[PDB]
Amino acid sequence: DYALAERQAQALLAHPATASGARFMLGYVYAFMDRFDEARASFQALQQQAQKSGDHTAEHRALHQVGMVERMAGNWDAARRCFLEERELLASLPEDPLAASANAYEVATVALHFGDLAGARQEYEKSLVYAQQADDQVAIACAFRGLGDLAQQEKNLLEAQQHWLRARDIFAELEDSEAVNELMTRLNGLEH
Amino acid sequence: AFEAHDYALAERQAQALLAHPATASGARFMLGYVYAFMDRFDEARASFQALQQQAQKSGDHTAEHRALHQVGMVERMAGNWDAARRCFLEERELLASLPEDPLAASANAYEVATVALHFGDLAGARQEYEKSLVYAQQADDQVAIACAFRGLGDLAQQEKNLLEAQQHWLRARDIFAELEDSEAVNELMTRLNGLEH
């Protein structure tokens, strides 16, 4: 599957006119194949291109992607830096609730990873409300799962339960049976 | 890559990148994969079908066979096995007139084998799975080797060879274990716990 996509995208890289779609593709492709060093380099070339061109739209997008791989690489400090910087560019750009939800959600994950629980509460909450605006049901679902996991960490199981049943419900309508199942582990582990 | 959030985001990113000639091809590709993952299969097929036509109106037979292959993979996942058969067989003739590409030969044969297995051509299945395995080894591709062995296992289960299927799946399990494909090893583990006689 993946080693097939890698050649397709490597053919797209040969031609200046398609090279940038190749890099976006390779970033993700390499991220699936768990090769985070090539995914980062792939996403960074796109960032550097956005810088020497102006458009802070390609740049914010490349930054979020770089921070995504940093997170997957377990470099949480580099991730923090990328999402904080992406947040700056966005404050200067025209409003984009989808961009802001994805950024909010990622800042909430980093914050939770580092123990700023009140901060993660606020970011998942932003991420949720921005997702309603943008109509992205999967982001809404993910936000509730995130709030619930935050609640469990605080031993607020009454809250964890309510948020996890909501995320579970949305994922079922989306027919994402993997996410439903994972929220079931969470919920049933809520016993004695 | 990873959770539901990554894919939903990736899709919306790819919808944005369709808006730019420089990023449009890359984005159609990603949309094909993402739609597939999401069991949104009509949308996955059309995405790949569009790349295939792009490919064929450029003279690019290489890009054409590889696009066509994903159309078939999408049809299999959808359960449109005849459309799938027709894709993979079609792709095979294209391949037969292109320079040696072991890795694409392995993948094609594996798909043709899988088709024939669904349809019950157990002589066909064996032939193609073995060819998929020969080309896998010619390419030095662990994943293709492991998948070919898994298919050989599924074929032995259909043949009702409980120890043959057992040896092949373990071979597949092992290879998938020394690649840390933590989910493939799990797909194999489910198969093993499923031989009640």
How many whole angstroms separate alpha carbon A127 and alpha carbon A105?
A: 5
Q: Would you say B75 and B84 are in contact if contact means Cβ atoms under 8 Å apart? A: yes
Residue B76 at interface with chain A, using a CB cutoff of 8 Å: no
From chain A, the residues in CB contact with B69 under 8 A are: 4
Question: Which of A2, A4, A7, A8 has the highest number of chain B CBs within 10 A, making it the mutation to test binding with B?
Answer: A8
Q: What method did the depositors use to determine the structure?
A: X-ray
B3/A142 CB distance under 8 A: yes
Residue A72 at interface with chain B, using a CB cutoff of 8 Å: yes
B23/A28 CB distance under 8 A: no
- Region label for A191, one of left (φ > 0), alpha (ψ between -120 and 50) or beta (otherwise): beta
How many whole angstroms separate alpha carbon A27 and alpha carbon B26?
A: 11
Question: Which of A7, A23, A24, A83 has the highest number of chain B CBs within 10 A, making it the mutation to test binding with B?
Answer: A24
How would DSSP label each residue in chain B? --SHHHHHHHHHHHHHHTTSTTTHHHHHHHHHHHHHHTT-HHHHHHHHHHHHHHHHTTT-HHHHHHHHHHHHHHHHHHT-HHHHHHHHHHHHHHHHTS---HHHHHHHHHHHHHHHHHHT-HHHHHHHHHHHHHHHHHHT-HHHHHHHHHHHHHHHHHHT-HHHHHHHHHHHHHHHHTTT-TTHHHHHHHHHTT---
B13/A61 CB distance under 8 A: yes
Count of CA atoms in the C-beta half-sphere (13 A) of B189 = 8
Residue B107 at interface with chain A, using a CB cutoff of 8 Å: yes
C-alpha distances in Å from residue B170, one per residue of B6, B113, B139, B149, B180: 32, 20, 22, 9, 15
Of A3, A28, A175, the CB nearest to B143: A3
How many whole angstroms separate alpha carbon B2 and alpha carbon B27?
A: 19
Instruction: Give the helix, strand, coil percentages of chain A, each rounded to 5.
Output: 80, 0, 20
Run of H or E including A180: helix A177-188
Q: Residue A32 burial (CB < 10 Å; 0-12/13-18/19+)?
A: middle
Which residue numbers in chain B precede an interruption (C–N > 2.5 Å)? Answer: none
From chain A, the residues in CB contact with B55 under 8 A are: none
A86: how many CB neighbours lie within 10 A of its CB? Answer: 24
Residue B110 at interface with chain A, using a CB cutoff of 8 Å: no
Q: How far is A155 from chain B (nearest CA, A)?
A: 24
How many whole angstroms separate alpha carbon A73 and alpha carbon A84?
A: 18
For residue A24, give the chain B residue with the closest CA: B26
Q: How far is B162 from chain A (nearest CA, A)?
A: 29
Q: Which CATH number fits domain B1-197: 3.30.70.260, 2.102.10.10, 3.90.550.50, 1.25.40.10?
A: 1.25.40.10
Residue B71 at interface with chain A, using a CB cutoff of 8 Å: no
C-alpha distances in Å from residue A144, one per residue of A125, A151, A168: 9, 10, 9
C-alpha distances in Å from residue B37, one per residue of A50, B18, B94, B181, B197: 29, 19, 27, 17, 34
B62/A20 CB distance under 8 A: no
Question: Which of A10, A15, A18, A20 has the highest number of chain B CBs within 10 A, making it the mutation to test binding with B?
Answer: A20
From chain B, the residues in CB contact with A138 under 8 A are: 4-5, 7-8
Q: Which of A187, A137, A138, A139 is nearest to A162 (CA)?
A: A187
How many whole angstroms separate alpha carbon A4 and alpha carbon A29?
A: 10
Q: Would you say A69 and A80 are in contact if contact means Cβ atoms under 8 Å apart? A: no
How many residues belong to chain A?
192
Q: How far is A166 from chain B (nearest CA, A)?
A: 15
How many residues belong to chain B?
197
C-alpha distances in Å from residue A163, one per residue of A102, A126, A170: 19, 15, 11
How would DSSP label each residue in B139-169? HT-HHHHHHHHHHHHHHHHHHT-HHHHHHHH
- At how many degrees (to 10) do helices A137-153 and B4-17 cross? 150
Identify the residue whose tokens are 């095979």: B92
Sign of CA dihedral B140, B72, A12, A83: negative
How many whole angstroms separate alpha carbon A142 and alpha carbon B103?
A: 38
Per DSSP (E only), the strands in A58-178 are none
Q: How far is B33 from chain A (nearest CA, A)?
A: 9
Enter the tokens of residue A21: 């779609």
Query: DSSP state, A15?
Result: S
Query: DSSP state, A93?
Result: S
- The rounded radius of gyration (Å) of the Cα atoms in chain B is 18
Please enumerate, as own/partner, the contacts of B60-68 that have beta carbons within 8 Å and a separation of 24 or more: B61/B94, B61/B97, B61/B98, B62/A11, B62/B98, B63/A8, B63/A11, B64/B94, B65/B91, B65/B94, B65/B95, B65/B98, B65/B104, B66/A4, B66/A7, B66/A8, B66/B104, B67/A8, B68/B94
B170-183 burial, b at 16+ Cβ within 10 Å, e below that, comes to ebbbebbeeeebee
How many whole angstroms separate alpha carbon B105 and alpha carbon B111?
A: 10
The structural architecture, per CATH, of the domain A1-192 is Alpha Horseshoe (1.25)
